[PDB]
Amino acid sequence: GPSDLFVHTEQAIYKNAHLTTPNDQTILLALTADLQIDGCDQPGPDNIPDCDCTSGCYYSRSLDRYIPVECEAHDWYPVEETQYYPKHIQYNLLIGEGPCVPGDAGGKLLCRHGVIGIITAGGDGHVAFTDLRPYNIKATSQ
Numbered sequence: 001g002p003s004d005l006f007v008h009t010e011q012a013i014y015k016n017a018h019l020t021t022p023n024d025q026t027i028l029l030a031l032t033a034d035l036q037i038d039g040c041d042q043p044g045p046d047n048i049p050d051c052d053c054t055s056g057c058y059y060s061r062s063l064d065r066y067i068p069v070e071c072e073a074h075d076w077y078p079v080e081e082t083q084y085y086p087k088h089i090q091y092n093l094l095i096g097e098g099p100c101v102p103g104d105a106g107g108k109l110l111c112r113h114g115v116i117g118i119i120t121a122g123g124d125g126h127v128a129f130t131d132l133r134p135y136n137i138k139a140t141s142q
């Protein structure tokens with residue numbers, strides 16, 4: 001079935017700006033990660049954990065189902081200029097070994113606990129994953 005929907009945590013709706021770019025109501029957004037956060041009274045179970053494992057499972061669109069994969073978390077990696085954004089450096093990226101296609105973007109990667117990041121980047125035999133951990137209500141401050 002259709003699994004293409006945004007994520008709502010408590011009162012923060014996280015989604016891809018390059019796939020949403022809504023009005024100017026978005027509370028805060030980080031162009032560096034092309035992620036936006038809006039407000040709403042539609043709280044969901046979506047609660048990013050405090051750990052971002054490496055070997056998990058992401059929703060593979062090529063097989064229309066979750067598949068086991070292994071990505072390595074990186075404090076920051078270079079993102080070659082593309083249709084999304086120009087050349088720069090991102091933060092919290094999980095690069096692994098998997099197929100990539102124009103649409104697979106958005107695949108949530110569940111680990112020992114659960115979703116730890118979605119597909120934000122993709123390359124040859126390599127798939128990046130935006131770590132949602134370093135953003136949610138894990139601690140903040142400092």
Ligand SMILES: [Zn+2]
Pocket residue numbers: 049051052053111112113114116
């Ligand atoms: Zn974990």
